[PDB]
Design a protein around this nucleic acid. Structure first.
Ligand SMILES: [Mg+2]
Ligand SMILES: [Mg+2]
Ligand SMILES: [Mg+2]
Ligand SMILES: [Mg+2]
Ligand SMILES: [Mg+2]
Ligand SMILES: [Mg+2]
Ligand SMILES: [Mg+2]
Ligand SMILES: [Mg+2]
Length: 50
RNA sequence: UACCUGGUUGAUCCUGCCAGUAGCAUAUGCUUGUCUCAAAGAUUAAGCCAUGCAUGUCUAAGUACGCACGGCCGGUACAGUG
């Protein structure tokens, strides 16, 4: 299942402003950036060993 | 600038101090037109204090669902300032 689908959003409607919906930033979410950081951490060990 | 002068005797030569002389640094008195520097509650009380200020800090890079502001899609995690 996808977590990004099930985020609880907050409606937000102030007088004189258009209606809006806000959702929080997901934390501890596996993203390509996390995998690439781990990949480079692994790749530095190879350089040290060589 | 390696310097002296008055005072003891009726007069003299001494010893010897007192007083005189010139800096310096604290106070005080009188006086004071222009410019450049410039010390300044140490001495008596490391005595006592009204009031105000004298220590705070964010980058692309720890944590933003404050519309507090803000552009588009509109479930389509999180635009940005903060
Ligand atoms: Mg995280
Ligand atoms: Mg005489
Ligand atoms: Mg003298
Ligand atoms: Mg003039
Ligand atoms: Mg004092
Ligand atoms: Mg004192
Ligand atoms: Mg002082
Ligand atoms: Mg101070």
């Amino acid at each position: 299942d996808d977590v990004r689908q099930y985020v609880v959003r907050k409606p937000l409607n102030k007088e004189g402003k258009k209606p809006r919906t806000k959702a929080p930033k997901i934390q501890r979410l596996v993203t390509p950036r996390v995998l690439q950081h781990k990949r480079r951490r692994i790749a530095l060990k190879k350089q040290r060993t060589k």
